[PDB]
Amino acid sequence: ADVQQKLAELERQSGGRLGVALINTADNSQILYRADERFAMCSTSKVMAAAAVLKKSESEPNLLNQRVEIKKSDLVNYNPIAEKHVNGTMSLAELSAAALQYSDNVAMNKLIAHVGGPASVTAFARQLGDETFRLDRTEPTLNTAIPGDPRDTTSPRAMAQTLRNLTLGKALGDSQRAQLVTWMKGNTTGAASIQAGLPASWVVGDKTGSGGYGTTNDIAVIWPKDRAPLILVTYFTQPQPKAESRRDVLASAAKIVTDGL
Ligand SMILES: *C(=O)N1C[C@H](NOS(=O)(=O)O)CC[C@H]1C(N)=O
Ligand SMILES: [Cl-]
Numbered sequence: 001a002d003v004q005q006k007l008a009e010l011e012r013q014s015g016g017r018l019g020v021a022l023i024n025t026a027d028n029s030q031i032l033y034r035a036d037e038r039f040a041m042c043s044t045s046k047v048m049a050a051a052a053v054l055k056k057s058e059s060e061p062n063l064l065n066q067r068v069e070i071k072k073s074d075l076v077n078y079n080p081i082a083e084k085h086v087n088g089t090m091s092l093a094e095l096s097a098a099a100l101q102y103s104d105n106v107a108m109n110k111l112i113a114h115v116g117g118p119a120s121v122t123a124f125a126r127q128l129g130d131e132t133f134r135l136d137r138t139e140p141t142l143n144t145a146i147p148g149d150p151r152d153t154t155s156p157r158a159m160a161q162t163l164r165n166l167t168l169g170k171a172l173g174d175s176q177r178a179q180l181v182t183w184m185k186g187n188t189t190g191a192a193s194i195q196a197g198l199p200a201s202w203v204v205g206d207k208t209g210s211g212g213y214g215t216t217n218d219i220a221v222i223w224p225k226d227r228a229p230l231i232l233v234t235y236f237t238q239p240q241p242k243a244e245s246r247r248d249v250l251a252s253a254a255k256i257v258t259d260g261l
Pocket of ligand 1: 209
């Protein structure tokens with residue numbers, strides 16, 4: 001009751017729509033809030049795309065070293081790493097790291113293209129047992145986050161279950177799983193989101209995202225000090241097309257659902 005009331009109060013205060021799913025692997029419990037509603041994933045979808053490449057690599061060992069041309073024509077709205085490599089190549093490993101750790105949207109597009117496009121990323125999700133996830137579009141349009149639009153959405157429950165599988169479970173081979181985890185732990189973009197609601201000593205691997213309608217998201221694997229890990233999805237979106245980011249709402253949600261652990 002208490003956690004639910006606190007999340008409803010946070011949602012009310014925020015003015016928007018909040019989705020939370022926490023999986024606590026200590027006792028196999030969950031904390032859920034709007035966990036079966038759809039939310040635009042925005043850049044949190046990059047985890048699935050990187051995982052698809054990692055899966056592909058299991059049957060093509062030299063895949064991560066494969067070189068990909070970066071051209072001016074590849075540039076999109078947010079190219080912090082790719083802009084440095086125009087007219088050269090990046091490896092699929094470098095593209096994965098750039099997508100996950102700097103949220104480079106060119107890098108995401110290369111991951112998407114490599115595996116066959118959004119419908120291939122979606123088919124991968126289905127193969128894992130995630131029947132909720134849908135990647136419809138490429139970057140940058142996948143971030144529009146229009147209310148009522150199912151494109152490029154998932155639910156907090158599904159994404160928490162899938163992230164658990166990918167990082168802590170057996171979706172990926174041991175080398176590939178370790179690589180995903182290392183990439184996520186090295187994320188540079190998440191300090192203001194879930195991490196901001198957790199004690200400083202906890203270790204986090206996360207992937208943030210943002211989009212239209214003030215959409216502000218984060219998904220994380222969390223290793224509390226001397227505890228079994230957690231998986232947390234916090235998705236948030238707002239009524240106004242040009243609403244401001246609210247990373248603080250994600251931090252507040254994280255604090256509410258972890259208080260006491
Ligand atoms: C992902 O949501 N996109 C790419 C980039 N992500 O950075 S974030 O994860 O720190 O939000 C910027 C926002 C967004 C986009 N609109 O392209
Ligand atoms: Cl602290």
